[PDB]
């Protein structure tokens, strides 16, 4: 029961947000944001650069000064504001979902029912954390009273991707604001619209000036300025593994700012012989094709047991063929276009590489429409570990199906990767599910399900998939600076 | 690697332990402790009563006074002391195990490899908690600094049973001492020897006088004196449901002392049709016959699915018949005698009741030896829920086997009880295990195993099986008195 | 900033609330609720009894059944509902404040600014806890996977007093609902109106029927029925020490339900010679006279160091004489009438007692008005520890000022009591504050302030002032039933 | 009481420790370790390089493989091993202390009473944590069972300094092993002896081969090899800010391994006018001169209020002049030599800079002996914020005394630094203590004391003094990898 969308929502925000005010780039330059479904320019957006980031960092630092409104505000009140923001986002839920679909390309139905719902749930979850992340009173040796204060890390720089514009912003702002930090956010050049509007709601909610500053623009410019800035205390990044390296190096070369990364992946989805066929097939399909295949934890390595391989592949091909591709604003559309031309060509390149390396193309493999960046749901069979499409993150509607024999075998092959963001296991057997979930080297292991996110459960990667965790209580750790206070007392007693 | 047992160890301790000194009862009266395997008197033991308890409490209260050695002692040092106690208990391991078997009746091998090992692991586990149960610093509203202090509850009265003399003593002392409390322990009249010897080790370990006081005696006298004492801050009890009511009533009638109970049970052991036959049989046998069936969490209700009922019963009867009953000091003995004549007659009474109520006697059902309190491994088939032997805790080697058809059926029948201490589920199916583990109303739900205790995991019951939890981190809660300190500050900041 | 009150608010709810519906007592009996300011009957209210309690318990038990809307509901949604209730209460804030003052007698300004504000903050705080009270995954020994489930305790019976009707209801519902429990609340016969209206808001908020049931009536009847009920899993009570004993005894004599108590006190307020005089005097006054002296943690023992005694007393007498007593609906009124005739007589009795035992009457000591139950702000000087007015809780506007010399002395005198709910220390010295905060045996120790309650900070008493803690994270413990699930795994690995 | 030391202890270990075996450098090269008291070479030590590091990493990785003795070992047993290692270090306490003094230069009395005691306390503290760092069971939305596994981060590369050879090793091993990780440690070229002997004790303790690997050698070679290694999962470093940057960049350039740093500092020690003169002076002296001034948290900026400045300086000078310098093995020696020639010259250079920039030399300022690296206790008065000695970490016996007027002023001046390791406040006033401890931007704030370390309390720096925290429960975070397991269930219930 989704409300009828406005297939052409008006844009009210397209500038740089600093101190609750809208500013044009110091250079007065602007960059175009394109609708991936048409290829046409939606509107111009202020191209923030280093000079702009410097204005944002100063605003943030000022808002973080001891004695300031944001610093003196009750922890509970910080929770009140987060809930207020969530309320305002829900009020403009219909509009934001449409604007999200317009700039990202994802189906409006999914934007409304999934993205916006998770955004609301994330902000409201962390709202409750605002006055509960307690410090500790420590029974240290000697005549002393020792305790820890959980203080805000400070000026936090947050660089987010384009796959989940609104959700990524919520995942970042939620924990940062709940812990009393200030933010300088750098949204993706491909999807800056929705984030900018939320900035308007952040002001409306009552958040003090400088607490949240958003600087739209390119990565090598605005993004790098934040990562290398001398007054940024912490940086959180979500994107490619390549840029993650640049971020951590920039942090080490600058002021040694704290860093947390959420990189890509090549998550394995293991389907045992005793799995519920119909369920496993549908979930495997969702596991990879969700959000145009543009998901960090996408099940891009579908391992299927030999005895059920053939039937599984058959059912998967059928499901992939019936997957409706088209205008994201039409309720029947299951898959919209890719985010941009760059990703569009990169995905086609991977498909071409899959053909060249001996992967058996089962369906799709080409452009789905003349206008826009639409790609057909592609499925590759008989994929081998050594193949490129089996190692590199495609980030598109390209499924890889591999065959295995033993449970010991699949573990080693699944773990044979530089990534380790997520993993899945489909089976009815207790011991098998427990053996695999423990053995698999991944941040999140789903059993008989996939892409099950909850603001209560932490999400992060192993190995080169990133470091640190987001969501849940763990999501507060990276946004907290621990201070130990040890006081001399006349005589310590238990 | 079980050392040769001294089949008649020397008794060095048989008096009341107060202020690290041995005292006779104020009345000079004594009571005999009997060897269950022979029925002969081992030795006399001081019969502590109210006046003796009053002395112990005063000693405890004094050792708990602010500024005393026990109160000023560093938390970490409290851990060192618990570790020292452990080492001393291990030094005299062989002796303790033998003395345990002599007074209790349980097999020497079991006392050594099971009971004493667990005792060591319990004290060592809690030793590590001594300086880790932190308080909190709370981000309260307004210009204040609020924090909590986790202080000792105070004088702790601990009344334990006879089924696991040494282990029950450790389960109580470990958390109590780790949190800096003082103890006035009332051991079972049937098995006071081993506990009294440990008191010697406690003194040798370096623990300040008054910190741990042991008063051997009867329940209506010494036990009630503790539960009704006006200066006892908290009381922990383990035994029958009947006395548990008396304890709670006494606490409410006296000074409203904090209370935690670990009562009996009629724990169900559910064997699904897809379970590992051999494993389930051996575990179900162990689940009920362990420690002469004198276990609080004994699986006295063995639910078996109809499709595998016949075979399971057959195998169970065979195992029950092969269970070696005899002298506990003999390496071949698997089942020793019952703790005493009262229990001996009570068990036989239940067996006679099982026969009169229509339960099918498959094997055993009578006295296993002329001398001592030995009973044959009895197994009843086609047991119905309404049967006495299916509702009341027998606490003996009397197995009950019930048949069921559906999973929804077994859950309802398993939960239909005033008890809820523990339960078990044997199956290879993931969903079945998860369904039953969540639906069963019990403190502990074992999956494909039984009687799996770990100092790391909490143990306690639902409904009338008790309140509160022992073992694990949870075991510290009842021994902690929380104090909030809210201080006015010049200006509160995050 | 306080909206003009409706001095004669309309009563819309006066029956028994069960399954989201209003019912008359099965006996059809009703009892009058009196306005303490005029002594006139406000209206009649359904007199609930045992049969009515049975109906409520059955409704709550049904709503708690596995698979019910309340049990299946997402933890996050539980928080959503609590947040909704809070919003509804704030909407009807002006109304509830007036109704609270009408039935209780406390100043309308206080009802609006303090009571209702604290109610909103309590419900909102606990709303955030709904999906954050995590269980644990334990690294148990052997090849096992052990974890704990934090399940609801079940059918919770809550008996609240009359000194803070709305607030006491929130302190009870907040933690109970946040943890998924069901409630059968028995409000005070003197102040049932506000709680009943809130029940209307509970239904409006969307809470499933049976989740919260309110039964207005007397103690020996309705209250006892809850405490003795065989199907009530836990009971929380707040009131007199005498009734607290009856409650714990009833629990032990019935089904061994879990019990937490919040009783009275004789809280000591220590004023050191180096304290801020003007601040200590005003705070010492507030500490005692707040809410007509009807506060559990009222500073009924004001200890003042000799060197500043005379000046402190002189200023305290002046402040007490300037305390405006009168119509609680008038903005100038500081002190309204006592809750009822019974309390009125009880306080007058204590005042006479103080005069008879040698306490020096410095001001007041008699009836403040002809109509209603108004008593003059009374101050006793040169009070000694042995005097009855120094040991027993008066619960009225009667201040006791005692003199002391050293800090070691005052600690001993302040701790020499069967009560230990709260205490305070007024001093500028760091060491003195830490020495006293540690030494005082009280649940809450305020430093340079008093009556500072925060939903984030736990509240409860030591000794006979109660057991267990309310508010903060600790407030969730008593409403949680811990379940351990130990699963056998193929091979356990770190 | 201190046992008579062997001024010339025998060296038993001087090679590379891998797989519990001693290996020579692959290149067969060795480096000399010098006795700072005489300048003479103690012995040659295997100069480990990249090739030796690779051998170590592979050994650790192998020992970390699923199903290995280290991975399958019960968490409780891991604590048993740490406790055992601690018992062995205590047995060889006298020897270790002597060898520590011989290689480092610190007084034997200090090494025995301070360093070794803290080492024993650190390892025993973490020993208790081994089986207590629980994961969580999360009440996520929908029909799912979500929980987190707290697994070991993996192969941990640890690089430690020379100021506290044994203690630094303990601070690293304790948390790493308690959580089940494997270590590749690179000790300081200046102090490799004691660490290597401990490795021998690690083997004797029963630790599996490959669990702990120690590779002695230089920084740019062995240290850089660990930081840039492709198979090292996490790196912990303690040393200069300069190398900290190198380590962070090396980690980002390689496999994006998790990084935590503990760098230098310019810790401010604020003495208010109301402080206890005698105590403040003695503590300020200790704050800076401890361990030859070679302490990361050394109070290198002594802020003293003008009203007491003159008297404070006078007393400090007298104390510095009386500080006995000489043979570290002599019981009367308070200050030994500096670690090496490099530091010796560096400190002498800073002293020269202090004179050049206008700082008032009050005492010392030159070489204290003809043989060895001894420096006279130097004190500079009237130091200004802009002076080099007031900004850069000297790491020697050079004290800086600065004068201030107001508390607001000292807060700003104290926080005006790129460092933020620790700070201290000396005052008798409660408000000032709380105001400053909250305002000071430092990882550890001491009140009326200094250098109070406790294994229970976290230690780490703000800003450029490092990231993350060591000691206490927080010290376990960096050595844990969080995995979320979300299982689909039939029907979720609270
Ligand atoms: N983990 C994830 O969910 C995401 C993964 N990716 C992966 O990365 C591939 C390429 O897509 P991109 O848009 O280029 O991802 P990216 O990691 O390069 O860019 C993402 C964010 O980082 C910013 N950025 C770019 N260069 C930067 C720099 N030098 N310093 C600081 N920030 C910088 C971008 O402007 C955007 O805000 C995708 O095909 C997919 O494989 C992309 C987005 C998200
Ligand atoms: Mg890029
Ligand atoms: Mg009995
Ligand atoms: Mg009454
Ligand atoms: Mg260097
Ligand atoms: Na776009
Ligand atoms: Na006996
Ligand atoms: Na009334
Ligand atoms: Na050296």
GROMACS .gro file of C-alpha atoms in nm, chain D residues 170-326:
model
  157
 1652UNK     CA    1   5.282  -0.757   2.918
 1653UNK     CA    2   5.045  -0.479   2.809
 1654UNK     CA    3   5.052  -0.633   2.462
 1655UNK     CA    4   5.046  -1.007   2.534
 1656UNK     CA    5   4.787  -1.003   2.812
 1657UNK     CA    6   4.491  -0.878   2.599
 1658UNK     CA    7   4.601  -1.047   2.276
 1659UNK     CA    8   4.633  -1.395   2.426
 1660UNK     CA    9   4.331  -1.354   2.653
 1661UNK     CA   10   4.121  -1.308   2.340
 1662UNK     CA   11   4.279  -1.600   2.153
 1663UNK     CA   12   4.502  -1.418   1.905
 1664UNK     CA   13   4.855  -1.500   1.785
 1665UNK     CA   14   5.149  -1.261   1.823
 1666UNK     CA   15   5.451  -1.152   1.622
 1667UNK     CA   16   5.633  -0.916   1.859
 1668UNK     CA   17   5.916  -0.681   1.766
 1669UNK     CA   18   6.093  -0.555   2.079
 1670UNK     CA   19   6.322  -0.250   2.093
 1671UNK     CA   20   6.681  -0.297   1.974
 1672UNK     CA   21   6.794  -0.118   2.291
 1673UNK     CA   22   6.615  -0.361   2.526
 1674UNK     CA   23   6.561  -0.710   2.374
 1675UNK     CA   24   6.698  -0.933   2.650
 1676UNK     CA   25   6.416  -0.948   2.907
 1677UNK     CA   26   6.145  -0.999   2.644
 1678UNK     CA   27   6.330  -1.299   2.498
 1679UNK     CA   28   6.369  -1.465   2.836
 1680UNK     CA   29   5.991  -1.429   2.884
 1681UNK     CA   30   5.942  -1.615   2.555
 1682UNK     CA   31   6.126  -1.904   2.722
 1683UNK     CA   32   5.876  -1.886   3.007
 1684UNK     CA   33   5.590  -1.870   2.754
 1685UNK     CA   34   5.708  -2.204   2.616
 1686UNK     CA   35   5.750  -2.344   2.967
 1687UNK     CA   36   5.398  -2.223   3.054
 1688UNK     CA   37   5.253  -2.455   2.791
 1689UNK     CA   38   5.163  -2.210   2.514
 1690UNK     CA   39   5.126  -2.383   2.176
 1691UNK     CA   40   5.401  -2.325   1.915
 1692UNK     CA   41   5.349  -2.018   1.698
 1693UNK     CA   42   5.114  -1.850   1.946
 1694UNK     CA   43   5.382  -1.601   2.051
 1695UNK     CA   44   5.673  -1.515   1.823
 1696UNK     CA   45   5.939  -1.259   1.914
 1697UNK     CA   46   6.162  -1.105   1.646
 1698UNK     CA   47   6.439  -0.878   1.786
 1699UNK     CA   48   6.589  -0.625   1.545
 1700UNK     CA   49   6.575  -0.270   1.409
 1701UNK     CA   50   6.267  -0.065   1.329
 1702UNK     CA   51   6.298   0.021   0.955
 1703UNK     CA   52   6.370  -0.346   0.887
 1704UNK     CA   53   6.185  -0.584   1.122
 1705UNK     CA   54   5.927  -0.333   1.245
 1706UNK     CA   55   5.838  -0.207   0.899
 1707UNK     CA   56   5.817  -0.566   0.776
 1708UNK     CA   57   5.542  -0.635   1.029
 1709UNK     CA   58   5.350  -0.312   0.959
 1710UNK     CA   59   5.348  -0.369   0.581
 1711UNK     CA   60   5.303  -0.747   0.588
 1712UNK     CA   61   5.016  -0.882   0.378
 1713UNK     CA   62   4.916  -1.151   0.627
 1714UNK     CA   63   4.921  -0.948   0.952
 1715UNK     CA   64   4.564  -0.871   1.057
 1716UNK     CA   65   4.631  -0.613   1.327
 1717UNK     CA   66   4.919  -0.399   1.445
 1718UNK     CA   67   4.968  -0.237   1.785
 1719UNK     CA   68   5.246   0.020   1.820
 1720UNK     CA   69   5.394   0.222   2.106
 1721UNK     CA   70   5.665   0.481   2.048
 1722UNK     CA   71   5.729   0.811   1.870
 1723UNK     CA   72   5.462   1.011   1.686
 1724UNK     CA   73   5.687   1.008   1.380
 1725UNK     CA   74   5.695   0.628   1.347
 1726UNK     CA   75   5.327   0.613   1.440
 1727UNK     CA   76   5.254   0.797   1.114
 1728UNK     CA   77   5.476   0.552   0.927
 1729UNK     CA   78   5.293   0.253   1.081
 1730UNK     CA   79   4.947   0.391   0.994
 1731UNK     CA   80   5.049   0.468   0.636
 1732UNK     CA   81   5.215   0.125   0.602
 1733UNK     CA   82   4.892  -0.038   0.719
 1734UNK     CA   83   4.682   0.157   0.469
 1735UNK     CA   84   4.927   0.083   0.189
 1736UNK     CA   85   4.936  -0.291   0.257
 1737UNK     CA   86   4.634  -0.500   0.361
 1738UNK     CA   87   4.441  -0.233   0.555
 1739UNK     CA   88   4.517  -0.407   0.885
 1740UNK     CA   89   4.354  -0.266   1.202
 1741UNK     CA   90   4.579  -0.016   1.383
 1742UNK     CA   91   4.606   0.120   1.739
 1743UNK     CA   92   4.876   0.362   1.853
 1744UNK     CA   93   5.026   0.479   2.182
 1745UNK     CA   94   5.254   0.774   2.107
 1746UNK     CA   95   5.427   1.042   2.312
 1747UNK     CA   96   5.295   1.344   2.497
 1748UNK     CA   97   5.351   1.678   2.669
 1749UNK     CA   98   5.122   1.610   2.965
 1750UNK     CA   99   5.025   1.913   3.178
 1751UNK     CA  100   5.033   1.891   3.558
 1752UNK     CA  101   4.819   2.174   3.701
 1753UNK     CA  102   4.884   2.276   4.063
 1754UNK     CA  103   4.612   2.505   4.202
 1755UNK     CA  104   4.679   2.747   4.488
 1756UNK     CA  105   4.471   2.538   4.730
 1757UNK     CA  106   4.673   2.220   4.673
 1758UNK     CA  107   4.871   2.044   4.945
 1759UNK     CA  108   5.216   2.196   4.895
 1760UNK     CA  109   5.424   1.901   5.022
 1761UNK     CA  110   5.223   1.644   4.828
 1762UNK     CA  111   5.199   1.846   4.505
 1763UNK     CA  112   5.576   1.907   4.504
 1764UNK     CA  113   5.669   1.541   4.563
 1765UNK     CA  114   5.412   1.421   4.310
 1766UNK     CA  115   5.517   1.678   4.048
 1767UNK     CA  116   5.878   1.564   4.092
 1768UNK     CA  117   5.774   1.201   4.045
 1769UNK     CA  118   5.545   1.301   3.758
 1770UNK     CA  119   5.843   1.408   3.552
 1771UNK     CA  120   6.154   1.233   3.686
 1772UNK     CA  121   6.004   0.881   3.695
 1773UNK     CA  122   6.199   0.620   3.492
 1774UNK     CA  123   6.471   0.874   3.401
 1775UNK     CA  124   6.193   1.098   3.265
 1776UNK     CA  125   6.142   0.833   2.996
 1777UNK     CA  126   5.766   0.802   3.041
 1778UNK     CA  127   5.504   0.865   2.772
 1779UNK     CA  128   5.270   1.038   3.018
 1780UNK     CA  129   5.546   1.231   3.197
 1781UNK     CA  130   5.424   1.560   3.341
 1782UNK     CA  131   5.653   1.771   3.122
 1783UNK     CA  132   5.450   2.092   3.174
 1784UNK     CA  133   5.416   2.182   3.542
 1785UNK     CA  134   5.157   2.458   3.564
 1786UNK     CA  135   5.166   2.635   3.903
 1787UNK     CA  136   4.935   2.917   4.019
 1788UNK     CA  137   5.117   3.245   4.083
 1789UNK     CA  138   5.030   3.278   4.453
 1790UNK     CA  139   5.226   2.960   4.532
 1791UNK     CA  140   5.465   2.957   4.235
 1792UNK     CA  141   5.774   3.090   4.418
 1793UNK     CA  142   5.751   2.845   4.710
 1794UNK     CA  143   5.669   2.553   4.479
 1795UNK     CA  144   5.971   2.621   4.257
 1796UNK     CA  145   6.200   2.656   4.558
 1797UNK     CA  146   6.089   2.320   4.700
 1798UNK     CA  147   6.107   2.152   4.360
 1799UNK     CA  148   6.463   2.271   4.304
 1800UNK     CA  149   6.574   2.135   4.641
 1801UNK     CA  150   6.406   1.801   4.564
 1802UNK     CA  151   6.570   1.778   4.222
 1803UNK     CA  152   6.913   1.857   4.370
 1804UNK     CA  153   6.874   1.582   4.632
 1805UNK     CA  154   6.774   1.324   4.369
 1806UNK     CA  155   7.047   1.060   4.390
 1807UNK     CA  156   7.198   0.968   4.051
 1808UNK     CA  157   7.430   0.672   3.998
   0.00000   0.00000   0.00000
